[PDB]
Symmetry: C3
Subunit: 248 residues, 3 copies
């Protein structure tokens, strides 16, 4: 048995919106410390890592560890049948090939109950090992999104150059080229051990920025020749972290 | 000769949005007492019945009774050329193969005239006879629409079960199942009300209920009426004018 | 060498929205007095004429007179990467095949630089000679846009009839016919309808092309229509303190 109640159910709505465009199917690892999900996209270019701590739920019971295999597209569809003000409860039995999602309306008079079929996934999960990065940029999440959106009209790749003054994003294609230059000050903050220059697929960054509604800020972490880390904090619950292999 | 000026024209915009997705062509029955329209959809699963009383109009003249045959798609397109605050007047002359719609802007300086061609339809109109129902549910129209919309992502059919505490809507398909449970509001401030002679359980096509909820902008509330083995009635009041009523045959094997 | 800074960069955003749906590529004629662009659509039905005076810019430098060939579609796409509150600067170096667009954000911490490739166009520009028109109508730009939009659901052509009382727009097609009748206003000057009639006129024009013109609507509260028998309609939007955007449309036969 597993039972997690979340009063701010919107959070879970946004989490699913943020994932289903990158991943069709993933394993939800439940345990006593909370919910963890970790998965590559189907092109093996990126990895996504989700953490929701048990203590961020309003109540949380997990008696045994569970690897629930979930169609994220299905789950997101069910979560659309939830009001943005609904109270959301997830419930699974020990054996079970189904996950129950229960939506309680603010007015108390409406309760919806969805039983979602699970699926069997063989995800022996590996991850990116923890490390310290040459460059770490903290900035408004909406600003980052607009940058990735703008440049994706110019080319399919973005070169990210981090010096000390600031950081520069540039792209190039059929219709010319563009670059966007950000300086240290809603604040923009930069922590530079050493300069770095990397090239990434904009297609994948625009998937990541679907997490924008979860957080005011976003953190980009870079070193030479290793995956970019794009991280959104989910306040008082955990984080959503995306890793993107550099282009060659 | 026929002339009706409306209490407010948006109402007629909403009526036509509410119909054109269900019916292509219908008869508008005009008389002294007002406007009546009654029609099955083309798959003969449902019936729609519209009543607009003369006394709900601002002025209303009908010297002879008319069955005006209307392309509802066309009429809805013309009504899109009307502002939501426009005053709307329908007009038909004695020898009418055309219906005139006249839109007067609030500022008085813009007047539009549209002449829509009619057609001859041989609608010998049958209807559901009046009756009392085992179950009658009154609820916010928007809540009902959201229910039908939500469940239509789960399956193509909804089982509606009415007991006394409350009413339950459920569906089932590829991706699992769902149900939605509604209770009576005792302590109102948006109320949900239930009148149960005897319990009932029926199954209906969601595709058709989602056509009906296109009437939602007409009314804050909606009334569902049920008995065993007979059409669901879904009714929106058009307050002080009349009503839009849908009937939906139950599903079987 | 050419450099024009515009604090209200939104203006330029709207100008390009207003053009790219009618013209793929055009010549920007730069000089000391400002920016002039003049071009036919590719079906040679209409002409568009843009004027932006140097004095309307916040700073403006043009050392020599220049015909820059621009993909308007490209330029509009780049201008979408500009915030609606950004400061916008255009820059062409001496002898360059590229136009630089530079966007400065209100917060000062973001600066974007886009370099657009230019192209060589052989536009020996012809224009409509200046004249006085039998009929001149000034009216709210949004009202005009709604008229063209409404009537384009009835037919592909609009007959415009100007008498003295007022002006009438009408159309006709499959689903019937429609006409819209506007009178002079005896609140504002940004809600008034004004008519100057030397002599009555009646012309017929393609609605498809009027609905391209009304993409300029966000530039101006008002629009001016100028007509005489057998000559192009002129539809004009003032760009306040800067210039104008003018569209000409050949009459239908």
């Amino acid at each position: 048995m597993f039972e997690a109640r979340l009063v701010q159910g919107s959070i879970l709505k946004k989490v699913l919106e943020a994932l289903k465009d990158l991943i069709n199917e993933a394993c939800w690892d439940i345990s006593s410390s909370g919910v963890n999900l970790q998965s590559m996209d189907s092109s093996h270019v990126s990895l996504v890592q989700l953490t929701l701590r048990s203590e961020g739920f309003d109540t949380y019971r997990c008696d045994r560890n569970l690897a629930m295999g979930v169609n994220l597209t299905s789950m997101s569809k069910i979560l659309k049948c939830a009001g943005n003000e609904d109270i959301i409860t997830l419930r699974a039995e020990d054996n079970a090939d189904t996950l129950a999602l229960v939506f309680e309306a603010p007015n108390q008079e409406k309760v919806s109950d969805y039983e979602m079929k699970l699926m069997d996934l063989d995800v022996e999960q590996l991850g990116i090992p923890e490390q310290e990065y040459s460059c770490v940029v903290k900035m408004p999440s909406g600003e980052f999104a607009r940058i990735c959106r703008d440049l994706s009209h110019i080319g399919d790749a973005v070169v990210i150059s981090c010096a000390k003054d600031g950081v520069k994003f540039s792209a190039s294609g059929e219709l010319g080229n563009g670059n966007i230059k950000l300086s240290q000050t809603e604040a923009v903050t930069i922590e530079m051990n050493e300069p770095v220059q990397l090239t990434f697929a904009l297609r994948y960054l625009n998937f990541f920025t679907k997490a924008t509604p979860l957080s005011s800020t976003v953190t980009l972490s870079m070193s030479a020749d290793v995956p970019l880390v794009v991280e959104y904090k989910i306040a008082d619950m955990g984080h959503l972290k995306y890793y993107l292999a550099p282009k060659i």
